[PDB]
């Protein structure tokens, strides 16, 4: 075969703060090697519960472009992140295609992300009120007005700020904890494939 290459997977698998729910921070990894056993070694063993490609052959069957994401949510939206189901994060923050090739990875993050006071830096879009096409980002920081009354100001009745916050106090149980999900996705443009694992030809 060949001498292997360092790959920036750990760069999106280890950080002091991931992005919040309002902006799923994209990271277009291209021209790298495929190695995911360190992902298994990082956490105690869980199923990926992931849909596109089976996890026993993510090392082989290699691709042309991996499009990776980095965002932190609740465990109900970990089981609810699947394509076809809607909600509030799955509709108003981040939606998947129906032909979505690629699959998600989740793990618990009580020891890193959660703080005893409760880190309110992680916040989500609850009010966006437009059905979302798959794979685009919307940053509507400005206040919405409802009730057929022109608001256009700061802090009034029926003038709702669209970005409210998670609470991450560590005394809660499984289901309201922070979870860092790294949604890998592959698209096939029929380009020359630069992302592949160890092999000899």
């Amino acid at each position: 075969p060949n001498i292997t290459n360092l790959c920036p997977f750990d760069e999106v698998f280890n950080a002091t703060r991931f992005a919040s729910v309002y902006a799923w921070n994209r990271k277009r990894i291209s021209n790298c090697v495929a190695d995911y056993s360190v992902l298994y070694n990082l956490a105690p063993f869980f199923t990926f519960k992931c849909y596109g490609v089976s996890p026993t052959k993510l090392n082989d069957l290699c691709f042309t472009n991996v499009y990776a994401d980095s965002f932190v949510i609740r465990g109900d939206e970990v089981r609810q992140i699947a394509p076809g189901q809607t909600g509030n994060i799955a509709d108003y923050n981040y939606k998947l295609p129906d032909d979505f090739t690629g699959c998600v990875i989740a793990w618990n993050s009580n020891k890193l992300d959660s703080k005893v006071s409760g880190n309110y830096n992680y916040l989500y879009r609850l009010f966006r009120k437009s059905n979302l096409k798959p794979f685009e980002r919307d940053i509507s920081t400005e206040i919405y007005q409802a009730g057929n009354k022109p608001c256009n100001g700061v802090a009034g009745f029926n003038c709702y700020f669209p970005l409210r916050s998670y609470s991450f106090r560590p005394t809660y149980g499984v289901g309201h904890q922070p979870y860092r999900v790294v949604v890998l996705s592959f698209e096939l443009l029929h380009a020359p494939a630069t992302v592949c694992g160890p092999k000899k030809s």
Partner: antibody, heavy 118, light 107 residues
């Protein structure tokens, strides 16, 4: 911002009407509407919630029997029933669901005392 | 489904005194929960936003605190216009479930 009762009368099993609740200027499509039921002598039971994205989430007891959509400009939510088994002799309360995360918004709506009997 | 349960069903004995009303859930939920007060034959009316806040016009002595599947609230003074019911409402974990019913009455 109040809500309007729209319904009544006596209906038979196998027949259904179109329940309606109107608004006083509140948007019904780009908001979060929700209806519940209240039987005589018993507690509330959740009927349906609709989001602004068009996500129809309703209870498993009434699966594939209730259809619900909001009007574009008349500010009235509509729901059509199918194949009523006469257990819903009750009063159906219309609202928007009362809080997103934290607000002083709280308004409820009046509902009509429908009955289903042969 | 979440089993919304309450044991102290009928606190008609308290007249201007301590109320120890509570509700419980089957699975572990956080503070995402509200209670209601439904007048007999009329619409419900809200008192608590998300287990830690209070409604705009109410007496201030209403105070609720609960975390980890046991949720607690008190009415230490029973003014005579509170003669109605009180229901427990879990949300944000579908399906949203209601309590069976709590009854208060003044003698």
């Amino acid at each position: 911002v109040q809500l309007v009762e729209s319904g009544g009368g006596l209906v038979q099993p196998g027949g259904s009407l179109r329940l309606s609740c109107a608004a006083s200027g509140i948007i019904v499509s780009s908001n979060y509407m929700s209806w519940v039921r209240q039987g005589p002598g018993k507690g509330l039971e959740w009927v349906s919630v609709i989001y602004s994205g068009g996500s129809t989430y309703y209870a498993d007891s009434v699966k594939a029997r209730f259809t619900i959509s909001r009007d574009n400009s008349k500010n009235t939510l509509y729901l059509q029933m199918n194949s009523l088994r006469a257990e819903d002799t009750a009063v159906y309360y219309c609202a928007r669901e009362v809080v997103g995360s934290n607000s002083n918004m709280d308004v409820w709506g009046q509902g009509t005392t429908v009955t289903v009997s042969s | 489904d979440i089993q919304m349960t309450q044991s102290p069903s009928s606190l008609s004995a308290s007249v201007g005194d301590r109320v120890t009303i509570t509700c419980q859930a089957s699975q572990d939920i956080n503070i995402y929960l509200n209670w209601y007060q439904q007048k007999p034959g009329k619409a419900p009316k809200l008192l608590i936003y998300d287990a830690s806040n209070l409604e705009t016009g109410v007496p201030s002595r209403f105070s609720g605190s609960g975390s980890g599947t046991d949720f607690t609230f008190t009415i230490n003074s029973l003014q005579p216009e509170d003669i109605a019911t009180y229901y427990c409402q879990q949300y944000d974990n579908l399906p949203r479930t209601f309590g069976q019913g709590t009854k208060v009455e003044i003698k």
